[PDB]
Design an enzyme around this catalytic site. Structure first.
Site, PDB file in Angstrom:
ATOM      1  N   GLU A   1       0.912  -8.374   0.584  1.00 26.04           N
ATOM      2  CA  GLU A   1       1.122  -7.006   1.128  1.00 26.04           C
ATOM      3  C   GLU A   1       2.604  -6.697   1.311  1.00 26.04           C
ATOM      4  O   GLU A   1       2.899  -5.652   1.924  1.00 26.04           O
ATOM      5  CB  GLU A   1       0.318  -6.792   2.419  1.00 26.04           C
TER       6      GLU A   1
ATOM      7  N   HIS B   1       0.809  -1.244   0.000  1.00 30.40           N
ATOM      8  CA  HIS B   1       0.000   0.000   0.000  1.00 30.40           C
ATOM      9  C   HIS B   1       0.837   1.288   0.000  1.00 30.40           C
ATOM     10  O   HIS B   1       0.228   2.381  -0.155  1.00 30.40           O
ATOM     11  CB  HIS B   1      -1.021  -0.017   1.116  1.00 30.40           C
TER      12      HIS B   1
ATOM     13  N   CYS C   1       3.279   1.641   9.827  1.00 31.46           N
ATOM     14  CA  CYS C   1       3.357   0.689   8.683  1.00 31.46           C
ATOM     15  C   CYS C   1       4.801   0.615   8.200  1.00 31.46           C
ATOM     16  O   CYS C   1       5.530   1.639   8.101  1.00 31.46           O
ATOM     17  CB  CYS C   1       2.343   0.950   7.568  1.00 31.46           C
TER      18      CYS C   1
ATOM     19  N   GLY D   1       1.207   5.403  10.902  1.00 36.80           N
ATOM     20  CA  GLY D   1       2.596   5.841  11.105  1.00 36.80           C
ATOM     21  C   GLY D   1       3.534   4.676  11.404  1.00 36.80           C
ATOM     22  O   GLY D   1       4.739   4.887  11.246  1.00 36.80           O
TER      23      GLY D   1
END
Ligand SMILES: C[C@@H]1CCO[C@@H]1C(=O)Nc1cnns1
Length: 182
Positions: free
Chosen positions: A72, A41, A148, A146
């Site tokens: 991911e 992402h 990730c 914040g």
């Protein structure tokens, strides 16, 4: 404060950079040579900022499992003039549960941040922001925007990178040794 934090600090101090994309600042783990990882992402393009330096992206691959399900993790090769310490021997070979993990973050917003997240479950399937995702680790800590890209470690192993949460639980994408064979 103890051997968990010692191992996490050792990884943060040599194997992380601050990555900036158009979707924000992320903790980015360098694995070997000029190869790093970041949550998918983050939407890596042709150019990325590494410690506020304009850097060409030589390759970026959004990983999926052999069911064609999102993992991911994006693997990024950076046009950087310096190699990372090779930490592939700290990656687990198989899917597993863990005790006593640390989530470590380093950005402008959260420098030198270490969180003792406790027991890590092999959760497996998660609908992450509406996207079916596999190989998810879960810990019972109220992680925030914040974190990730934060690195999940136990003593002696680098086991995942933080990719989301629900306000009560946090979720990481597994790192496996097989992602980084060359
Ligand atoms: C903050 C966003 C918008 C609302 O819900 C999202 C969320 O829970 N994010 C995260 C939690 N833990 N790590 S990221």
């Amino acid at each position: 404060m103890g051997p968990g934090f010692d191992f996490a600090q050792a990884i943060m101090k040599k194997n992380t950079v601050i990555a900036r994309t158009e979707k924000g600042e992320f903790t980015m783990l360098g694995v070997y040579d000029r190869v790093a990882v970041i949550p998918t992402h983050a939407s890596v393009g042709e150019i990325i900022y590494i410690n506020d330096v304009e850097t060409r992206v030589l390759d970026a691959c959004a990983l999926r499992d052999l069911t064609d399900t999102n993992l991911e993790i994006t693997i990024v090769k950076l046009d950087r003039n310096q190699k990372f310490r090779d930490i592939r021997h700290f990656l687990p070979r198989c899917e597993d549960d863990y005790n006593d993990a640390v989530l470590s973050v380093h950005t402008s917003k959260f420098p030198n941040m270490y969180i003792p997240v406790g027991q890590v479950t092999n959760y497996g399937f998660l609908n992450l922001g509406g996207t079916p995702t596999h190989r998810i680790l879960m810990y019972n800590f109220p992680t925030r925007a914040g974190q990730c890209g934060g690195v999940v470690t136990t003593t002696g192993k680098v086991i995942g990178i933080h990719v989301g949460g629900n306000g009560a639980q946090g979720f990481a994408a597994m790192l496996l040794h097989s992602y980084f064979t060359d």
